[PDB]
Amino acid sequence: ADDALAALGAQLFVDPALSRNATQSCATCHDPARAFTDPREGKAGLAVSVGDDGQSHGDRNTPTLGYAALVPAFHRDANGKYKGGQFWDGRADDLKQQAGQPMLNPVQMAMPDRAAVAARLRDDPAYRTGFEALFGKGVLDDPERAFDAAAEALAAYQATGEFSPFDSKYDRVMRGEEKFTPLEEFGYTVFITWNCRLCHMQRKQGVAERETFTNFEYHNIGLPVNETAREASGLGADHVDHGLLARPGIEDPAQSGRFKVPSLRNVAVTGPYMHNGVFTDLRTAILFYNKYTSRRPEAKINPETGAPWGEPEVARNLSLAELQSGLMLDDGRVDALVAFLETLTDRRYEPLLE
């Protein structure tokens, strides 16, 4: 059952047969060697990913799958804050619900429908054995059950310890196995006393058992459009990415421009950053937060472009209460934060830190 389901998902995950031209698997964009993100250079660099047809670019940055299985299913909590879900806009409830969507998305894996997904599954004798042992005889002859089963296998694969090993230095330090360096401890202290912890910590107080450095909420931090990614996505220069509000069922205009607080785990190796991969450097992403706190000229300017950050793609619902902290991060605290953030790199990616 649970091993075997996940092993099935493991097959599917790397199988380009689930793409129209059979040129792309999940693993093409969520490359395990790149904390399950897309190392492939496209028109907008690494901001966005290219689909199976070799032309179509998405309009959002491919996120890591690492630790995505710790995100609760999408729900509105008693304070009226939306939490959890999958995708940058929480439009998928959970992993299972998310898994079939790349397969059928014409700008990603581009399979025409569930039936064509099922037919590719029937081509492979290994799948007929694998899927039948777990979900019963004839499962692949029924497109719905086939596609749901593929989705469940994928979700189960993503829930394995491989995707969320909690073996970062931060983890070893919290178990008393290791000590942070001075700079990393400074970084941590800053992280938990400054505004970051207001959103990139699981809990408001007390101690999380499996901290993933997100509270799973939705916030508009006022980011600009990634012009070249937006050009590449072909959604047009008139387009506005409304974030959470694009989730079907969410109607509240207070949610326009809000995106899910990403886990900062492996953040050091999953550039570029933000939902549109607008920032190539981690340091830049940290610096962006100073635009709300710092009175200095250098705070209005994206150090990667030398030009002003740009106006928010969505100018309302900014989380100003959290972002206008009254204190700006000096260079040493930015260093400290980068250091701390790098401690959240899973063991197997520590080699990628250069």
Binding site: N79, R203, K204, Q205, G206, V207, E209
Partner: protein
């Protein structure tokens, strides 16, 4: 006899043990109720002052309200709001004066109105509860002015605006009886009834003089607005009662709070709020002690309780502390609140047995005034 602080520790340790999360946030005070008590600390004439909002049943501070120089607190009897008239200056105790009325939500304690009073018109005096007073409907606050002459200021709390000053005779204190009417106590030993409109010379009528010029009526009489009862001790513990419920003044028979033997042995009332009146029980409480005749503002260690109708002594409690002010919750089985200005402590007593139940200490610098709502 497990304390506030001990129960909290226990509860917090359990949430940590259980991994219980909670959002740090701003608490709401519990709903106003009959056992809520307010203590104002005029802080011995300091430029800034504090009111403590207290759950008298628990003996717990549930909130605080900042104020200025000798603010006058008022508490709507029905619990809907509290307010004060206060005074600030641009540079602490000097510079431009601004008198203002703030009205506050009684659970969030947030100001819901801030109403400037023009020309700095408040009377600045050691706090006498009945020098600023709400009309029974809660819609108007009436404040006394002494300078240049006695006058009363009218503030519309519904429209959040100062209305007008009213010219009055040589009289003092403000006991409102209607949306447009209040009584004052005059120098000539009468009461003055003042009936006022949005404009015009107010209708002012005096009662018969009800005390001789050598009988001294204290600055802190008890007034139940809901009963229309004005209970007004003299220096000797002679207690004048005036029934204003009919809308005009009827003088009730005088009672002595102390006996002839007690008086001959030097017993007299004394303190600040020396007298309390429990509306439902029709009972007078009077802070008394043996004292020289001119030690009338000193604390007292004894509370006599007497039936307002007959004058019959019902109890003499030995308060066990130096008490300057008393008041009572207005519910059944009332608490008898005994405020020590010197201890900065509200002692909360069972008003039937006199037994001390609990206490709330650290109530500012010189707390003197207890206010309860009469919510029943």
């Amino acid at each position: 006899q497990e304390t506030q602080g001990q129960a909290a520790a226990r509860a917090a340790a359990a949430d940590l043990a259980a991994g219980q999360d909670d959002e740090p946030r701003i608490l709401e005070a519990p709903a106003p109720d009959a056992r809520r008590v307010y203590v104002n600390d005029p802080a011995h004439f300091a430029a800034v002052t504090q009111q403590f909002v207290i759950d008298g049943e628990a003996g717990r501070v549930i909130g605080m309200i900042d104020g200025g120089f000798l603010p006058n607190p008022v508490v709507a009897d029905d619990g809907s709001f509290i307010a004060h008239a206060s005074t600030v200056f641009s540079r602490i105790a000097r510079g431009e004066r601004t008198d203002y009325v703030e009205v506050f939500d009684p659970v969030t304690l947030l100001p819901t109105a801030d109403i400037e009073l023009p020309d700095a018109p408040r009377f600045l005096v050691g706090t006498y509860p009945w020098m600023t007073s709400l009309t029974p409907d809660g819609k108007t606050l009436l404040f006394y002015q002494f300078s240049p002459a006695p006058a009363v200021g009218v503030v519309d709390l519904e429209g959040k605006a100062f209305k007008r000053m009213l010219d009055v005779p040589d009289c003092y204190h403000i006991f409102p009886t209607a949306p447009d009417t209040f009584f004052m106590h005059c120098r000539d030993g009468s009461l003055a009834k003042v009936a006022f409109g949005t404009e015009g010379t107010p209708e002012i009528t005096h009662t018969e003089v009800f005390h001789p010029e050598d009988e001294f009526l204290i600055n802190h009489p008890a007034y139940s607005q809901k009963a229309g009862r004005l209970v007004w001790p003299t220096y000797t513990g002679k207690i004048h009662q005036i029934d204003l419920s009919s809308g005009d003044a009827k003088f009730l028979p005088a009672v002595e709070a102390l006996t002839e033997a007690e008086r001959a042995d030097g017993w007299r009332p004394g303190g600040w709020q020396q007298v309390a009146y429990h509306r439902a029980l029709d009972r007078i409480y009077l802070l008394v002690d043996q004292r020289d005749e001119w030690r009338h503002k000193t604390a007292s260690r004894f509370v006599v309780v007497l039936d307002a109708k007959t004058g019959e002594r019902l109890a003499k409690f030995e308060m066990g502390h130096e008490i300057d002010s008393i008041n009572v919750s207005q519910d059944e089985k009332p608490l008898l609140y005994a405020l020590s200005t010197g201890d900065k402590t509200l002692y909360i007593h069972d008003a039937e047995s006199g037994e001390e139940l609990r206490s709330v200490n650290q109530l500012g610098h010189g707390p003197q005034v207890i206010t309860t709502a009469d919510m029943g």
